Amino acid sequence: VKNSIIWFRKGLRLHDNPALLEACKDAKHVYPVFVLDPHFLQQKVSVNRYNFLLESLEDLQRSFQARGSRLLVLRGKPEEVFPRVFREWGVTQLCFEHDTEPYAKVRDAAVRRLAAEAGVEVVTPISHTLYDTDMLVARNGGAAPLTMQSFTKLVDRVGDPPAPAPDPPAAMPPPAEDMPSAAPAATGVPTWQEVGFKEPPLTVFKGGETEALARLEAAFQDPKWVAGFQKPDTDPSAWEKPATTVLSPYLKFGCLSARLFHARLLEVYRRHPAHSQPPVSLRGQLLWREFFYTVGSTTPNFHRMAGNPVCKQIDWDDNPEFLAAWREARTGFPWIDAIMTQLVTWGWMHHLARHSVACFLTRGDLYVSWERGMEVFEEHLIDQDHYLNAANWMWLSASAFFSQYFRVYSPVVFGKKYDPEGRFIRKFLPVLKDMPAKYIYEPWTAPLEVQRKAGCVVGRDYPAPIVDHAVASKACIARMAAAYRRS
Ligand SMILES: Cc1cc2nc3c(=O)[nH]c(=O)nc-3n(C[C@H](O)[C@H](O)[C@H](O)COP(=O)(O)OP(=O)(O)OC[C@H]3O[C@@H](n4cnc5c(N)ncnc54)[C@H](O)[C@@H]3O)c2cc1C
Ligand SMILES: [Cl-]
C-alpha cells in the first residue's frame, strides 16, 4: 500500500497545493507534517511573525480535522526526524513544495538522500512562485534578467503562469492509528508562550489560509480598485484601511497561492480594458516578487554585500549610535519614528513607508549599511522574505537595481503630502497626540509654550533630531557620487 507524507515548510494552505494532491492520490495513509525546531530561539525572531506562523498552523489543523485528518507538528531537525518516521509509518512517498532559498537547498538535498536510502519517492512541484524560476532563466539564454523591463518581457513571451491546482478531496486518508511518533501530545501546535516568548504579539493581522482568502475576497470586492491599481500613487499613511492589499505575510508563508492571486487578476483585467499595466499594477507587484526571486536564486551571496556580483561596494559607516536610534524609534523625526514603531507593533508598513526609513538609514541621512537595517527588518516584519527583503534594501541604498542617488526623501516633507494633520503620527506616537499639526513633523520648531501646552517637551518627552537633514543628506549625496565614480 501507499503511505505518504506531505511536508509543510512554506505553502501553508490547502488550495493550489499540487504536492498535497499527489500525496493523497491512491494513498492509504497521509501524514501532514510540519517540522518545528524547538531550540530556534536559542540562536532574531519577533513574537509577531512567529505567532503568525503558529496561527497559520492552527488553521491547517482545523482544515485537516474537517477532512478526517490531522496536522502533525514534529519537534526536532528534519535530518534527524525523517529517517525515523520513514520506517515507522512505512512511508513510500514524500511530497513538499519546492523552495529556492539557500538554506532550503542544503536542507532538501539532505532529506532527498535520506529518502533514497529508505526507498521513498520524492515529488517536489513548484507552486510558491508564479513560474518555474529555473525555466525562466533557461528561456532567457541561461542568465536571469537584471531589469524589470526585460523580465516583464520574458514572462510575456512565456505566457500565463500555470493555473491554480484543484482543491483537495473532501475526505483525506488519515494517519495510521497508534503510531508513537504521531501521538497527539507530541504533535500538537504550540502557543507563543510555550515556545519561550515572554511578551504577547501586538499585530492586527492574523495568520492562516482562511484569513488569506478572506483578505483576498475583500481586495476584489471593488474591481475598479483592482483594475486601476497604481503602486506609487497609494498612501503610506493610511492605517485604518491600508492603501494596498496587505497580502505579503500570507504570500510569504504560502497561506495564499500566488497563482490564484494571478488568476483572479486576469479575470478582472479581461472585463476592464483600461486596467493598469506592469510594473505599477497589482500584477506587476507579483512580478516584482517573481523578478527578485529569479535574480536572487541565481546570484551568489545575494543577502550580503561582499561577494555579491550584483551589489555595489560602498564604504558605509560603522555607526552603532545612529543604528540604535533608528532601531529604537528615537531619531527625533516623528515620521521616521512612527514608521519604525509600526514595524515593531504591526510587523508591516506600506511600501513607501519602508522607503522612508530605509533611505533615512542608508544613502539618505545616516549612511549606515543596508545590511544592518536589514537585520532589523528580518526580526520584526511578519512578511520578511529572504529575497524580497534583500533586493529592496539594495534598491533603497542604491547598491543594486536602483541608481538615482540624487533622489533623497525628506523625513519632514514626505509624509506631509499625504497626511498634513499627522493622523498616522498621532496613532503610533501618542506622545505627540496634542501637538498642533503645524509642528507635528518638526516638533523641535514649536515654541516652548506650545510644547508645554501639548505635554511634549523636546529633549524630555520626545528626542531632538539626531541630525540636520539638510546637512546629513548633502554629505551622503557627495559620498554616494564619489563611490559611483570608481564603480
Ligand atoms: C526596504 C524594503 C524591504 C522590504 N522587505 C520585504 C519583505 O521582507 N517581504 C515582502 O513581502 N516585501 C518586502 N518589501 C516590499 C514591499 O514593501 C511589500 O511587498 C509591500 O509593502 C507589501 O504590501 P502589500 O502586500 O499590500 O503589497 P501590494 O502592493 O498589494 O502587492 C501585492 C504583493 O506583491 C508583492 N510585492 C509588492 N511590492 C513588492 C516589491 N517592492 N518587491 C517584491 N514584491 C513586492 C508582495 O508579495 C505583495 O504582497 C520590502 C520593501 C522595502 C522598500
Ligand atoms: Cl521628498
Ligand nearest to the CA of 335: 2
- Cell numbers for 97, please give them: 513544495
Is 231 annotated in some ligand binding site?
yes
Q: Determine which helix (DSSP H) or strand (DSSP E) holds 46, and give its type and residue range.
A: none
Topology of domain 1-127 in CATH is Rossmann fold (3.40.50)
Neighbours of 150 (CB within 10 A): 12
Which residues are paired to 94 by β-bridges? 5, 122
**How many secondary structure helices (H) and strands (E) does the chain include?**
19, 5
Which amino acid, 158?
V
Task: Write b or e for each residue in 326-365: b if 16 or more Cβ atoms lie within 10 A of its Cβ, otherwise e.
Answer: bbebbbbbbbbbbbbbbbbbbbbbbbbbbbbbbbbbbbbb
Residue 47: burial class (beta carbons within 10 Å; 0-12, 13-18, 19+): buried
* 319's grid cell: 555607526
Distance CA(397)–CA(407), nearest Å, equals 11
Supply the residue whose CA is at minimum distance from atom 24 of ligand 1: 246
Q: Does 389 show up as a binding residue in the annotation? A: yes
Distance 469 CA to ligand 1 centre (A): 27
CATH class of 128-164+209-299: mainly alpha
Ligand 1 neighbours by CB, cut-off 6 Å? 231, 244-248, 251-252, 285-286, 288-289, 292, 350-351, 354-355, 358, 377, 381, 383-385, 388-389, 392-393, 396
CB within 8 Å of 232: residues ≥ 6 apart: 280, 352
Q: Which residues contact 8 (CB under 8 A, 6 or more apart)?
A: 32, 33, 34, 60, 71, 96
Q: Is 290 annotated as a binding residue?
A: yes
**Is residue 279 reached through a cis peptide bond, with omega within 30 degrees of 0 on the bond before it?**
yes
129 to each of 71, 164, 227, 254, how far by Cα in Å?
24, 12, 22, 10
Q: Which is the closest atom of ligand 1 to the Cα of 219? A: 30
Handedness of CA 292, 297, 299, 300 (dihedral sign): positive
Give dist(CA 130, CA 185) in Å, integer: 37
Three-state DSSP at 95 gives: strand
Residue-wise DSSP of 138-185:
HHTTSS--SSHHHHHHHHHHH-SPPPPPPPPPSS-PPPPTT-GGG-GG
| Domain limits, the chain | 1-127, 128-164+209-299, 300-485
- How was this entry determined? X-ray
- The CATH class, in words, for 300-485 is mainly alpha
Resolution value, angstrom units:
2.0
Residue 279, classified by CB atoms within 10 Å of its CB into exposed (0-12), middle (13-18) or buried (19+), is middle
Place of cell 484601511: 241
* 392 marked as binding residue: yes
Phi, psi for residue 8 in degrees, rounded to 5: -95, 130
* Cβ–Cβ under 8 Å, residues 440 and 430: no
Distance from the alpha carbon of residue 248 to the mean position of ligand 1, in angstroms: 6
* Sequence-ordered list of residues with C-beta below 8 angstroms from that of 231, at least 6 positions apart, any chain: 244, 279, 280, 281, 282, 284, 285, 351
